[PDB]
Amino acid sequence: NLDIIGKRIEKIKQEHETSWHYDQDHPYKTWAYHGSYETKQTASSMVNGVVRLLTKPWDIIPMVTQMAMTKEKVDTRTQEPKEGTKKLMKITAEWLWKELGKKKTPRMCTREEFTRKVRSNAALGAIFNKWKSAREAVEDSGFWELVDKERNLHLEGKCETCVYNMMSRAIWYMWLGARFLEFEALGFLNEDHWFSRENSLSGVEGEGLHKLGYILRDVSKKEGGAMYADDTAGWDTRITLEDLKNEEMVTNHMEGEHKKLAEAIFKLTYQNKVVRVQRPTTVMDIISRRDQRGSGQVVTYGLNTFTNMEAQLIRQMEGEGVFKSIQHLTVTEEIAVKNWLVRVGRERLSRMAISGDDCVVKPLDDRFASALTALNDMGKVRKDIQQWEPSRGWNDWTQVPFCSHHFHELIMKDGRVLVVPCRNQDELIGRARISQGAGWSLRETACLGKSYAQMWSLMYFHRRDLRLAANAICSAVPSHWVPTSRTTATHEWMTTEDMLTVWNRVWIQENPWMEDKTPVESWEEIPYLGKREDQWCGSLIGLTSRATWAKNIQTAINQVRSLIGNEEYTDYMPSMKRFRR
């Protein structure tokens, strides 16, 4: 408690020693409240005019238009689990780290790795303040003094400047220096692909939307019961102290300066948070707590994946009756769990596809559906079902939801079999029509649109409206202008190369589920979903407004060409059969 956080709080108390007050109408019961000073400020989503002008039929679809417009679960507290649960979680975490580290070496990430990261404009979610942008503070050795200072503080076992700014979400920013030190200690989890499928068997980190469908299908091929895919209710707010402690056991695989630094992040930022919060009543409240998730977007992913793999293995143990009760674990129930992990624990990881808080499990049989005592006690309460009502399974990998997607089996006119990702096309068009940020040029706007268009052509080519609208946007943006993206899966659509050539690389060449690597010569070799499948997943094919739009597409393309100016443009519409004269 208050020794570990006191320093961070005293430094802020003094930064605003003109303001300090212990207010009596503070709405925090779960969050420890320490005081407040004075402030006054707020990020609304803007519309991409290039994408909107080339998707006109969707101007009257509320599912699309509504997306463009527009904290009582973060004030909850999960009961510390039963003892038998704590034992199960501790034993499984131990085994899992060993498994994940069998062919990886934990290592410190570098200034030079973090420097290049912010320059190529990755999202690390920091605050703007001594410097301007993310890019400014990196080029300057007086910054890395402020970093150097903190780093030595962490080795000394204290912490001064590592404070969360708050603003089923609510993202926790940290000043860049704080994000560096996190990244230095734990960046290896992402950067060295600890949660690749090759390395973790359950994981899909860096597999890409074009491989996930194939991965669910290979899980389907295993003998067993239904595919379960239960979402947890507000998973970040359900991360117990015991989860943070079991996550910390990765430091047991570390050494030297690294081991101390990783230990510092876990003990001082994760297991003892300090957070500054705007309360429009506007002030800045300074609250603490020992539990819940609050890392950076990217480390959160890897740790969520870890704890999720752990819970689902344990839910599988309960379904297979490896243990009976969670109130306390016997010493034979210990050796039985242990014997299980050793004998079948790798086989059981390969029955799962886990991506942070999200999972699909094909358990050994359907007893799994009513194995709820361990899961509920770990605090990983399922969403939109009664706490003790059995999970409902899926009989068909092409119905399982995973990473906001479903997957179709699509058979090429030459018999080869693509497995393609999909979701409600209103979702895909509403997202493409949004440009997060202030002060975009017509050219930067146009280049974002082209990123979406190039993705549609790569991932969602089997949807008729998305192929046509992608050809239209790429016809309407200068052929040579480069795709952009302000918070960068595997993004092979981020290139100026011929898209049919990328398609052959991604779907034929680099695809391990394709045994015949015969290139595809033109876009008409590449099949669509069935017309009715396309309509089920939101297609406007058959509607009057869409038939007009398609017939008169070269007129919308020209409107955009005229707003941008006289530049060098390619016509891509002859790539489709109907427009090919």
**Euclidean distance between the first and final Cα of the chain, in Å?**
73
Count other C-beta atoms under 10 Å from residue 203's C-beta: 26
d(CA 458, CA 510): 14
Residue choice 394, 513, 528, 579 for contact with ligand A1BDH (CB under 6 A):
394
To the nearest whole angstrom, how small is the minimum distance from the Cβ of residue 264 to Zn ion? 7
To the nearest whole angstrom, how small is the minimum distance from the Cβ of residue 358 to ligand A1BDH? 13
Subset of 139-178 contacting Zn ion (CB under 5 A): 150, 159, 162
Q: Is 382 in the site for ligand A1BDH (CB under 6 A)?
A: yes
Partner interacting with residue 159 (select from Zn ion, ligand A1BDH, none; CB below 5-8 Å by kind): Zn ion
Binding-site positions read 150, 154, 159, 162, 169, 231-232, 234-236, 304, 357-358, 383, 406, 408, 422, 537
In this structure, are residues 163 and 12 in contact, taking their beta carbons and an 8 Å threshold?
yes
To the nearest whole angstrom, how small is the minimum distance from the Cβ of residue 159 to Zn ion? 3
**Of 272, 251, 271, 250, nearest in space to 260 by CA:** 251
Partner interacting with residue 359 (select from Zn ion, ligand A1BDH, none; CB below 5-8 Å by kind): none
What residue has token string 């669910």?
216
- Pick left, alpha or beta for residue 437 (phi over 0 → left; psi -120 to 50 → alpha; otherwise beta): left
Count other C-beta atoms under 10 Å from residue 120's C-beta: 7
Residue 229 vs 499, nearer CB to ligand A1BDH? 229
d(CA 243, CA 41): 35
Residue 77 vs 382, nearer CB to ligand A1BDH? 382
d(CA 134, CA 125): 9
Residue 182 vs 207, nearer CB to Zn ion? 182
To the nearest whole angstrom, how small is the minimum distance from the Cβ of residue 407 to ligand A1BDH? 16
To the nearest whole angstrom, how small is the minimum distance from the Cβ of residue 329 to Zn ion? 36
Partner interacting with residue 382 (select from Zn ion, ligand A1BDH, none; CB below 5-8 Å by kind): ligand A1BDH
To the nearest whole angstrom, how small is the minimum distance from the Cβ of residue 360 to ligand A1BDH? 11
* Burial bucket for residue 221 (CB in 10 Å: 0-12, 13-18, 19+): exposed
- Pick left, alpha or beta for residue 158 (phi over 0 → left; psi -120 to 50 → alpha; otherwise beta): beta
Helix (H, G, I), strand (E, B) or coil at 297: helix
Contact characters 208-247, ligand A1BDH, x per CB under 6 A: ----------------------x-----------------
Binding-site positions for Mg(2+) read 231-232, 357-358
To the nearest whole angstrom, how small is the minimum distance from the Cβ of residue 349 to ligand A1BDH? 21
Buried b or exposed e, range 151-184, using 16+ CB within 10 angstroms:
bebbeeebbebbbbbbeeeeebbbbbbbbbbbbb
Partner interacting with residue 162 (select from Zn ion, ligand A1BDH, none; CB below 5-8 Å by kind): Zn ion
d(CA 329, CA 343): 20
φ/ψ of residue 19, rounded to 5: -110, -35
Residue 389 vs 567, nearer CB to ligand A1BDH? 389
Helix (H, G, I), strand (E, B) or coil at 577: coil
Residue 146 vs 229, nearer CB to ligand A1BDH? 229
Q: Is 274 in the site for Zn ion (CB under 5 A)?
A: no
For 497, the token pair is: 């190369």
To the nearest whole angstrom, how small is the minimum distance from the Cβ of residue 392 to ligand A1BDH? 4
Task: Quote the radius of gyration of the chain (alpha carbons, Å).
Answer: 26
The counts of H helices and E strands in the chain are 23, 11
Q: Is 537 in the site for Zn ion (CB under 5 A)?
A: yes
Contact region with ligand A1BDH (CB under 6 A), list: 65-73, 86-94, 317-325, 384-392: 384-392
To the nearest whole angstrom, how small is the minimum distance from the Cβ of residue 385 to ligand A1BDH? 4
In order of 421, 505, 506, the CA distances from 501 in angstroms are 20, 6, 9
In this structure, are residues 381 and 388 in contact, taking their beta carbons and an 8 Å threshold?
no
Contact region with ligand A1BDH (CB under 6 A), list: 129-137, 239-247, 378-386, 455-463: 378-386
Q: Is 406 in the site for ligand A1BDH (CB under 6 A)?
A: no
Q: Is 474 in the site for Zn ion (CB under 5 A)?
A: no
Binding-site positions for Zn(2+) read 150, 154, 159, 162, 406, 408, 422, 537
To the nearest whole angstrom, how small is the minimum distance from the Cβ of residue 394 to ligand A1BDH? 6
For 366, the token pair is: 């359907």
Helix (H, G, I), strand (E, B) or coil at 227: strand
Q: Is 410 in the site for Zn ion (CB under 5 A)?
A: no
Q: Which residues pair with 284 in a beta bridge?
A: 37, 278
**Of 17, 74, 41, nearest in space to 287 by CA:** 74
Residue 72 vs 384, nearer CB to ligand A1BDH? 384
For 114, the token pair is: 């973090």
Residue 84 vs 538, nearer CB to Zn ion? 538
Q: Is 284 in the site for Zn ion (CB under 5 A)?
A: no
Residue choice 63, 336, 385, 412 for contact with ligand A1BDH (CB under 6 A):
385
Q: Is 259 in the site for ligand A1BDH (CB under 6 A)?
A: no
| Helix ranges restricted to H, 320-357 | 331-349
Q: Is 504 in the site for ligand A1BDH (CB under 6 A)?
A: no
For binding to ligand A1BDH (CB under 6 A), which residues are involved? 230, 382, 384-385, 391-392, 394
Which residues of the chain form contacts with Zn ion (CB under 5 A)?
150, 159, 162, 422, 537
